Amino acid sequence: QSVGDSIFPSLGQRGLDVQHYDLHLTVPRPGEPHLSGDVTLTVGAREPLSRIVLDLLGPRVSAAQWNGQRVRWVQTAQKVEVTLPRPLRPGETGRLRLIYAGTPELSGDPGLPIRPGWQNEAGLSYSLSEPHGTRGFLPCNDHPSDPATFTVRVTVPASASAAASGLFTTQTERNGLKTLTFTQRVPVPTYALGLIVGPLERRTAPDVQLGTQTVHRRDIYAAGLPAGTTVPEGETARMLRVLSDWFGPYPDEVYGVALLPVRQLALETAGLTTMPATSNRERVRLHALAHQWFGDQVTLADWADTWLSEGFATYAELLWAESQGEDGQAMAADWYARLSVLPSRPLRATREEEIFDASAYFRGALALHALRLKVGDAAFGQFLHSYVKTFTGRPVSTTALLTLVKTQLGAEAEQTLRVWVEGRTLPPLPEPV
Ligand SMILES: CC(C)C[C@H](N)C(=O)O
Ligand code: NA
Ligand SMILES: [Zn+2]
């Protein structure tokens, strides 16, 4: 029934393929968790589905429709189950509309660096939902194996404003209320959906041209940011070219950061990174941008493989440093140092406390470093292009990476990667031959 995640075995519904969320969210008082929702899901299926089971934690569903007609539905625990008049079969799509309202619940999971879900602090409400927090404010197939496109229609008080992932199209105002529309036109995981409401100002920058591709530029500045909370002029343009030259074209139409005056980790929300000021650094801005490839475009099949996103996003830091004339080998040496005093575990996490631990970031990065040094920069750069392509539209797993390594680069490169992926060992620091 569920996706069957090795870490979160209850989230999601197997075979469900959500393709588009058309969400109308109304936030009455930014900074307080209550809200109302009006979402229509365009869903497909990999297998016949008698029921559409979505994740939801907090708000209560009031009405449900399927293809425009009233439909039977039940909200049970952290799930909303919708009985279809006839099974949804592969190849066909339907429209599931849900009216809901209430208070999103935060998922205070024990081993996570954050409490994912609808955040509320200092007159600001925003989503920081990795891994399984999106279900708090949106009925969803809450798993990274099922990315989807988003159209969000945010209704807020006139005094406030809002920003979501995707290009901002229209804004209307009536009876002292404001409505902003954003369209995320490239599929990304539920936790990758940016959504911020409160005192914030949009700021655009000139377009960035990456060959034939055009990437729009805009940043969000919330009120009350600390002095010096900025984006260095020209930095994001240079970062885009360096990373896109390694990975392939930037997968989205816009990029920027949403600088918040709060104290929290940064989240790679699609095309608009949720960036609390206490994390606004050059290597975190590069990190978040790298995740637009590894994490938002290339999505995980199982939360045990977070190193496919964090290790890849961490290695981009080394590539960016080298692009700026720095010694990347010395950065890899720092990674090893923070590992040589920590125990080992395979890269595939077995419990929730490990999915965002030091090994998922640095041991995964050093795994890529070991592979790169074994095949050469040219072969390694070509694999990263092939890796992204191979896993666009298809969730990535550790097994699939090793297979692609074996297929593309040979068994020796594979065994080098397998030493770091499997083994419960800390291998020696990868150094140039
Ligand atoms: C917010 C965190 C739990 C995850 C995020 N992707 C990072 O930068 O590590
Ligand atoms: Na999908
Ligand atoms: Zn990250």
XYZ file of C-alpha atoms and ligand atoms in Angstrom:
444
model
C 0.000 0.000 0.000
C 2.643 2.498 1.103
C 5.752 3.377 -0.883
C 7.622 1.041 1.461
C 10.500 3.377 2.313
C 13.216 1.639 4.317
C 13.311 4.605 6.727
C 9.681 5.832 6.627
C 7.686 2.672 5.826
C 4.270 4.388 6.057
C 4.564 7.447 3.800
C 3.205 7.565 0.276
C 1.154 5.128 -1.793
C 2.765 2.580 -4.099
C 2.019 3.023 -7.791
C 0.603 6.514 -7.266
C 2.040 9.066 -9.712
C 1.003 12.594 -8.791
C 1.748 14.784 -11.804
C 0.475 18.234 -10.792
C -0.688 19.950 -7.603
C -3.061 22.875 -8.165
C -3.077 24.323 -4.650
C -5.010 27.346 -3.380
C -3.662 28.063 0.110
C -5.108 30.801 2.330
C -2.920 31.927 5.238
C -5.034 34.248 7.433
C -2.309 35.359 9.867
C 1.304 34.872 8.714
C 3.328 33.519 11.616
C 0.459 31.441 13.012
C -0.012 27.887 11.746
C -3.734 27.879 10.862
C -4.642 27.866 7.163
C -7.184 26.577 4.645
C -6.501 24.587 1.492
C -8.105 23.887 -1.883
C -5.945 21.476 -3.898
C -6.648 19.525 -7.091
C -4.252 16.640 -7.760
C -3.769 15.282 -11.275
C -2.794 11.684 -10.508
C -1.591 8.781 -12.618
C -0.781 5.194 -11.680
C 1.938 2.607 -12.236
C -0.508 -0.097 -11.095
C -4.308 -0.204 -10.758
C -5.392 1.864 -7.749
C -8.803 1.389 -6.152
C -8.048 4.234 -3.720
C -5.986 7.420 -3.688
C -4.159 7.508 -0.344
C -2.506 10.850 0.413
C -0.441 11.971 3.389
C -1.872 14.684 5.632
C -0.947 15.613 9.206
C -2.946 18.276 11.022
C -5.589 19.873 8.804
C -8.977 18.220 8.378
C -10.522 17.449 4.996
C -14.007 18.919 4.593
C -14.884 17.880 1.025
C -13.496 15.697 -1.747
C -14.196 15.372 -5.460
C -12.930 13.045 -8.189
C -13.041 14.362 -11.771
C -15.460 17.056 -10.593
C -17.937 14.741 -8.834
C -18.378 14.143 -5.114
C -16.469 11.066 -3.979
C -16.240 8.907 -0.868
C -13.264 9.680 1.359
C -12.022 9.001 4.885
C -9.292 10.708 6.930
C -7.538 8.154 9.138
C -4.466 8.830 11.287
C -1.981 10.525 8.943
C -3.718 9.436 5.719
C -6.685 10.517 3.606
C -8.097 7.584 1.623
C -10.354 8.325 -1.360
C -12.436 5.483 -2.805
C -12.670 5.878 -6.571
C -15.855 4.903 -8.456
C -13.673 2.668 -10.655
C -9.947 1.883 -10.387
C -7.411 4.326 -11.791
C -5.392 2.293 -14.277
C -1.968 2.993 -15.837
C -2.163 5.415 -18.740
C -5.155 7.349 -17.381
C -5.248 10.471 -15.222
C -7.836 11.888 -12.852
C -8.511 15.072 -10.916
C -8.714 14.735 -7.125
C -9.932 17.883 -5.362
C -9.730 18.236 -1.576
C -10.991 21.068 0.630
C -9.207 21.187 3.973
C -8.473 23.534 6.854
C -6.822 23.448 10.245
C -3.391 23.526 11.866
C -0.395 21.762 10.273
C 1.458 19.453 12.647
C 5.246 19.423 12.768
C 6.950 16.038 12.423
C 9.330 16.105 15.375
C 11.298 13.045 14.349
C 14.022 12.123 16.869
C 17.060 11.862 14.596
C 16.451 14.731 12.274
C 18.416 18.009 12.236
C 15.111 19.917 11.891
C 11.433 19.496 12.685
C 10.046 19.285 9.127
C 6.706 20.852 8.295
C 4.874 24.170 8.277
C 7.095 26.612 10.177
C 5.763 29.618 12.089
C 7.956 32.267 13.724
C 8.394 36.060 13.746
C 5.387 36.853 11.573
C 6.577 34.363 8.941
C 5.041 31.075 7.840
C 7.058 28.921 5.466
C 7.653 25.315 4.466
C 10.824 23.527 5.607
C 9.568 20.030 5.052
C 12.454 17.713 4.162
C 12.006 14.824 4.501
C 8.318 14.251 5.354
C 6.923 17.595 6.473
C 4.953 18.597 3.377
C 2.046 16.402 4.508
C 1.557 18.909 7.330
C 0.065 21.622 5.118
C -0.696 19.761 1.869
C -2.395 16.413 1.107
C 0.341 14.696 -0.814
C 2.099 11.569 -1.919
C 4.842 12.556 0.530
C 7.828 10.714 -0.884
C 10.748 11.901 -3.047
C 10.166 8.978 -5.434
C 7.056 10.793 -6.754
C 8.027 14.294 -7.917
C 5.357 16.506 -9.417
C 4.711 19.947 -10.828
C 3.093 22.605 -8.665
C 0.826 25.585 -9.215
C 0.297 27.463 -5.950
C -2.276 30.233 -5.503
C -1.438 31.907 -2.182
C -4.044 34.119 -0.498
C -2.596 36.435 2.165
C -3.492 39.706 3.898
C -2.788 42.836 1.878
C -0.182 43.957 4.429
C 1.824 40.788 3.727
C 3.055 39.002 0.606
C 4.132 35.522 -0.457
C 6.620 33.609 -2.585
C 6.576 30.015 -3.835
C 8.695 27.915 -6.158
C 8.180 28.622 -9.834
C 7.799 31.806 -11.809
C 5.519 34.416 -10.272
C 2.736 35.136 -12.753
C -0.213 37.087 -11.348
C -1.234 38.937 -8.203
C -4.762 40.141 -7.460
C -6.296 41.952 -4.504
C -9.842 42.296 -3.192
C -11.517 42.976 0.168
C -8.114 43.585 1.725
C -6.786 40.182 0.621
C -4.015 39.420 -1.876
C -3.643 36.383 -4.149
C -0.314 35.397 -5.721
C 0.173 32.589 -8.250
C 3.379 30.619 -8.843
C 3.958 27.826 -11.371
C 6.640 25.190 -10.743
C 6.836 23.805 -14.278
C 9.558 21.191 -13.675
C 8.730 18.208 -11.425
C 10.340 18.198 -7.972
C 9.676 16.395 -4.678
C 7.024 17.648 -2.272
C 9.635 18.890 0.207
C 11.224 20.859 -2.659
C 8.105 23.057 -2.949
C 8.961 26.497 -1.604
C 6.198 28.437 0.129
C 6.792 31.533 2.278
C 4.298 34.134 3.509
C 4.822 37.295 5.518
C 6.841 40.506 5.243
C 9.010 39.865 2.180
C 10.101 41.807 -0.900
C 10.897 40.452 -4.347
C 14.177 41.427 -5.984
C 15.016 40.510 -9.577
C 18.442 40.318 -11.208
C 19.375 40.205 -14.909
C 18.850 36.939 -16.760
C 21.652 34.363 -16.735
C 22.446 32.756 -20.094
C 23.820 29.198 -19.949
C 24.371 28.572 -23.632
C 20.950 28.426 -25.261
C 19.208 28.037 -21.883
C 17.905 31.135 -20.090
C 17.637 31.167 -16.286
C 15.669 33.961 -14.643
C 17.018 35.560 -11.473
C 15.057 36.739 -8.446
C 15.671 36.727 -4.697
C 13.280 37.176 -1.774
C 14.236 39.441 1.137
C 12.118 39.129 4.256
C 11.902 42.075 6.620
C 14.311 42.437 9.517
C 17.317 40.623 8.079
C 20.662 41.116 9.851
C 22.985 43.716 8.375
C 25.107 42.209 5.620
C 22.592 39.509 4.637
C 23.226 39.707 0.896
C 23.874 37.768 -2.293
C 27.270 38.858 -3.704
C 26.729 40.449 -7.105
C 27.636 38.080 -9.929
C 28.172 35.109 -7.598
C 25.015 33.191 -8.533
C 25.738 33.671 -12.238
C 29.239 32.224 -11.852
C 27.946 29.384 -9.662
C 25.316 28.528 -12.277
C 27.891 28.272 -15.076
C 30.410 26.236 -13.063
C 27.813 23.742 -11.826
C 25.913 23.494 -15.124
C 29.235 22.872 -16.883
C 29.660 19.793 -14.649
C 26.095 18.461 -14.483
C 24.274 19.576 -17.623
C 21.683 22.315 -18.110
C 20.082 23.872 -15.055
C 16.798 21.944 -14.648
C 14.608 24.949 -13.771
C 13.555 28.302 -15.212
C 14.602 30.519 -12.280
C 16.994 30.479 -9.356
C 17.414 32.610 -6.266
C 17.331 32.550 -2.494
C 14.620 33.518 -0.016
C 16.607 35.093 2.817
C 14.698 34.738 6.109
C 15.661 36.454 9.394
C 15.307 33.161 11.239
C 17.980 30.757 12.526
C 17.740 27.456 10.672
C 19.415 25.240 8.095
C 19.012 26.035 4.415
C 16.659 23.948 2.282
C 17.015 23.513 -1.473
C 13.428 24.456 -2.304
C 13.028 24.345 -6.070
C 14.354 27.375 -7.945
C 14.119 29.415 -4.735
C 16.228 28.101 -1.867
C 14.798 28.661 1.609
C 17.820 30.392 3.164
C 17.692 31.387 6.838
C 20.239 34.143 7.408
C 22.383 32.065 9.794
C 23.234 29.733 6.888
C 23.745 32.375 4.181
C 27.331 31.560 3.166
C 29.074 31.039 -0.160
C 29.447 27.288 0.303
C 25.831 26.873 1.431
C 24.514 28.928 -1.497
C 26.551 26.723 -3.838
C 25.401 23.657 -1.877
C 21.720 24.575 -2.205
C 22.154 25.324 -5.917
C 23.824 21.946 -6.492
C 20.783 20.272 -4.929
C 18.620 21.725 -7.720
C 20.284 18.985 -9.777
C 20.867 16.262 -7.167
C 17.709 16.101 -5.070
C 15.170 18.233 -6.926
C 15.669 16.913 -10.473
C 17.331 13.594 -9.602
C 15.109 12.418 -6.747
C 15.573 9.617 -4.234
C 13.802 6.271 -4.501
C 14.372 5.605 -0.784
C 15.335 7.936 2.054
C 18.174 5.555 2.964
C 20.074 6.939 -0.058
C 20.218 10.589 1.076
C 23.952 10.584 0.298
C 22.994 10.591 -3.392
C 21.760 14.135 -2.721
C 23.890 15.316 0.207
C 27.146 13.697 -0.895
C 26.631 15.026 -4.416
C 25.658 18.490 -3.166
C 28.695 18.421 -0.871
C 31.092 17.438 -3.657
C 29.876 20.394 -5.733
C 31.468 22.565 -3.036
C 34.855 21.040 -3.890
C 34.224 21.549 -7.610
C 33.241 25.176 -6.998
C 36.332 25.758 -4.848
C 38.589 24.331 -7.562
C 36.803 26.526 -10.113
C 37.774 29.498 -7.917
C 41.461 28.523 -7.870
C 41.413 26.756 -4.496
C 42.999 23.415 -3.578
C 40.205 20.856 -3.787
C 42.439 18.079 -2.456
C 42.819 20.068 0.770
C 39.032 20.337 1.071
C 38.773 16.564 0.618
C 41.393 16.222 3.365
C 39.138 18.172 5.742
C 36.245 15.818 4.941
C 38.395 12.795 5.800
C 39.523 14.401 9.072
C 35.918 14.740 10.253
C 35.457 11.052 9.356
C 38.642 9.571 10.860
C 37.290 10.194 14.382
C 33.749 8.956 13.573
C 32.587 5.313 13.187
C 31.628 3.795 9.877
C 28.367 2.518 8.421
C 27.544 1.879 4.744
C 26.417 4.864 2.687
C 22.876 3.448 2.551
C 21.383 4.532 5.873
C 19.618 1.957 8.038
C 17.968 4.320 10.545
C 16.556 7.829 10.456
C 19.322 9.452 12.525
C 21.839 8.628 9.768
C 20.038 10.058 6.726
C 21.414 13.550 7.456
C 24.541 12.599 9.416
C 28.195 13.409 8.732
C 28.776 10.301 6.579
C 25.859 11.113 4.281
C 27.548 14.433 3.482
C 31.304 13.825 3.623
C 31.692 10.053 3.220
C 29.448 10.403 0.179
C 31.518 13.299 -1.157
C 34.767 11.386 -0.619
C 33.163 8.459 -2.450
C 32.774 10.725 -5.484
C 36.325 11.997 -4.936
C 37.620 8.415 -4.999
C 35.732 7.738 -8.239
C 36.886 10.985 -9.871
C 40.563 10.327 -9.147
C 40.298 6.761 -10.488
C 38.862 7.733 -13.898
C 40.171 11.248 -14.537
C 38.427 14.606 -14.633
C 37.193 14.086 -18.196
C 35.596 10.693 -17.520
C 34.261 11.920 -14.168
C 32.783 15.052 -15.729
C 31.133 12.939 -18.418
C 29.673 10.562 -15.826
C 28.071 13.425 -13.883
C 26.433 14.511 -17.139
C 25.344 10.910 -17.727
C 24.273 10.416 -14.097
C 21.873 13.382 -14.183
C 20.478 12.281 -17.553
C 20.114 8.637 -16.489
C 18.011 9.600 -13.452
C 15.822 12.399 -14.813
C 12.258 11.141 -14.502
C 13.457 8.055 -12.599
C 14.249 7.999 -8.859
C 17.857 7.114 -8.085
C 19.130 4.433 -5.711
C 22.587 3.375 -4.574
C 22.299 0.076 -6.467
C 21.491 1.985 -9.665
C 24.489 4.296 -9.215
C 26.932 1.387 -8.917
C 25.356 -0.271 -11.967
C 25.696 2.937 -13.990
C 29.295 3.245 -12.769
C 29.893 -0.359 -13.851
C 28.145 0.175 -17.191
C 29.753 3.515 -18.063
C 33.198 3.501 -16.438
C 34.041 -0.174 -15.879
C 34.331 -2.618 -13.016
C 37.476 -1.095 -11.500
C 35.746 2.262 -11.068
C 32.742 0.362 -9.690
C 34.791 -1.558 -7.121
C 36.433 1.698 -6.031
C 32.971 3.166 -5.427
C 31.723 -0.040 -3.787
C 34.539 0.149 -1.217
C 33.108 3.473 -0.050
C 29.428 2.610 -0.507
C 29.517 -0.833 1.114
C 31.937 -2.117 3.717
C 31.421 -0.490 7.161
C 35.028 0.664 6.640
C 36.643 4.071 6.363
C 38.815 3.627 3.240
C 42.099 5.547 2.977
C 41.861 9.167 1.908
C 41.583 9.366 -1.913
C 44.740 11.071 -3.174
C 46.164 11.619 -6.671
C 48.130 8.599 -7.885
C 17.347 20.897 5.770
C 18.206 19.647 5.873
C 17.511 18.594 6.722
C 18.511 19.081 4.487
C 19.117 20.015 3.437
N 18.955 19.450 2.103
C 20.591 20.268 3.736
O 21.162 21.274 3.319
O 21.253 19.468 4.397
Na 4.944 12.060 -10.182
Zn 22.205 19.426 1.309
